[PDB]
Amino acid sequence: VVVLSFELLHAPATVCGPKKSTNLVKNKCVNFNFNG
């Protein structure tokens, strides 16, 4: 039995899932997903 425990907002996120990042545009209302 394997138990996985996660911690949020304690520090800068070091472990992430695989999602391809894109270049960030500025000055236009856009969805932002920074580090989750």
Next chain:
Amino acid sequence: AYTNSFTRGVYYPDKVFRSSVLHS
């Protein structure tokens, strides 16, 4: 030994940035 620490020991409680605001 003793001696009094006037106001020492204050540190930033969390990485989150704030400015020009009082925070409890």
